[PDB]
Amino acid sequence: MEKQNIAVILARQNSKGLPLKNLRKMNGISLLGHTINAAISSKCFDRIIVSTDGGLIAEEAKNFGVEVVLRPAELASDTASSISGVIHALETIGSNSGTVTLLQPTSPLRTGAHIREAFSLFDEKIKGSVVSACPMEHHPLKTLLQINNGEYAPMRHLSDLEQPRQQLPQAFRPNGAIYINDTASLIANNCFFIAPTKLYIMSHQDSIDIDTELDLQQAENILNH
Amino acid sequence: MEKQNIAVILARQNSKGLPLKNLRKMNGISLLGHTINAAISSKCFDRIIVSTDGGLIAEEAKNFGVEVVLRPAELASDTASSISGVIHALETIGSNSGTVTLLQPTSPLRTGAHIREAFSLFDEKIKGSVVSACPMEHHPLKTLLQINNGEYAPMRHLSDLEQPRQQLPQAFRPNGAIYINDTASLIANNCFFIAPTKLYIMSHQDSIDIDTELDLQQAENILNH
Ligand SMILES: CC(=O)N[C@H]1[C@H]([C@H](O)[C@H](O)CO)O[C@](OP(=O)(O)OC[C@H]2O[C@@H](n3ccc(N)nc3=O)[C@H](O)[C@@H]2O)(C(=O)O)C[C@@H]1O
Ligand SMILES: CC(=O)N[C@H]1[C@H]([C@H](O)[C@H](O)CO)O[C@](OP(=O)(O)OC[C@H]2O[C@@H](n3ccc(N)nc3=O)[C@H](O)[C@@H]2O)(C(=O)O)C[C@@H]1O
Ligand SMILES: [Ca+2]
Ligand SMILES: [Ca+2]
């Protein structure tokens, strides 16, 4: 096979929250369109695929000049895993060698430059994931986990709960915007986090994820800096 | 000595953020007053002390009918630890036996009922802390910690990052509203988290902490249910 860099944008029609979320407009452009534009402007991809079950989403993708994979209902339900959708897209276009990047439409402030910056961290020899991430608002060592009913244990040391944050290791969470993997590795492991995983760090501002109407408005306000 | 249940409300005059924050009004009552009212209505305390360096805060505390400890400047600076303020209050009134509870004015939706509910968890024989806490918005096992420059390691397992949250242990963070300790233990350990620490769980709504003008408005709106 030819090695290919593939972008997969999963955009199902039924959004369990905000209705028709993937086509909702932000500064005049659909969420889908913002992420398609990021994929194109990154110049990182040989193939850009929108995977959907919805006719309106498919028409939007075609109007932006990218490929469409149609998902049957069982891969677009509320319970369907993202990994099964990415696997189905790769099987449909016939790629099992190269890289595959998931780009969620719910991260509209993730730009093509962010994608290029993340790609520069990918190690073609070692082939761990590159995942975009942002700093944790509340430090995860300053937490306790339930071990029994009404019984809790510190995440690490009890003394961590009173340590100045600057004296603790820096902590990060995935923000959903970018997951880059070696294609054969993603197929074999059937997941998005493959060791050794590297992080591409983004600001809290650029990590906004759209769930609510107020999220859409905040993202618009951020664009209008 | 007589064993005493002491409440200490630390309320310094200089707020590094919102100016004069501890006297800012919320539905007509100062933040200080809301927490004093919680301490009184809990009926958990033999002594209620407001510790401050500020004349206006001291006058407000006296008007609510509680005791005042005056802190010298070195215990009320931007760098001064909360524990040193609680230790100084206990030394001033001469108590080293019983319980001591820190009640921060920045948690105005923490009520007297919350204080009673937390106190019911305190174990007078084993004498670990009781700390009020709320659920973590982002699960702390779904994080990575920096171990070297540009090198990160999962908090626990890499597979935790893709686990449904409901399949992970429940996680909680202190919310700042209540810290209950055995008095002799707090003096000896010079800290607020003493094993075995128990958690009193509060909702995200009741855990609001005041840092901004918008925080004050949100807390007011919550009160007006
Ligand atoms: C990679 C992955 O597991 N993605 C999941 C993400 C991820 O964990 C977070 O965003 C990280 O912060 O979480 C979810 O993210 P969510 O349900 O909002 O979906 C994000 C975007 O992906 C599309 N989608 C999702 C699943 C699927 N089978 N097909 C799809 O087309 C949606 O239409 C939307 O554009 C979640 O909220 O539960 C579910 C997603 O499946
Ligand atoms: C127990 C403890 O360590 N408290 C600290 C808390 C705590 O960790 C969080 O609230 C938990 O979510 O964090 C701080 O909390 P913060 O600075 O807002 O202070 C909270 C309240 O305590 C008063 N205060 C604080 C310290 C001190 N030496 N004297 C005081 O009178 C303030 O006037 C205000 O009413 C922080 O933001 O850094 C600093 C506080 O010292
Ligand atoms: Ca989501
Ligand atoms: Ca604070």
UniProtKB/Swiss-Prot annotation, chains A, B:
InterPro entries: CMP-NeuNAc_synthase, Cytidylyl_trans, Nucleotide-diphossugar_trans. Gene3D superfamilies: Spore Coat Polysaccharide Biosynthesis Protein SpsA, Chain A. Disulfide bonds: none annotated. Its main location: cytoplasm. It is found in: Cytoplasm. The keyword Cell inner membrane does not apply. It comes from the Bacteria. The keyword Iron does not apply. It holds the Pfam family CTP_transf_3. Belongs to the CMP-NeuNAc synthase family. This is N-acylneuraminate cytidylyltransferase. It comes from Neisseria meningitidis. The gene is neuA.
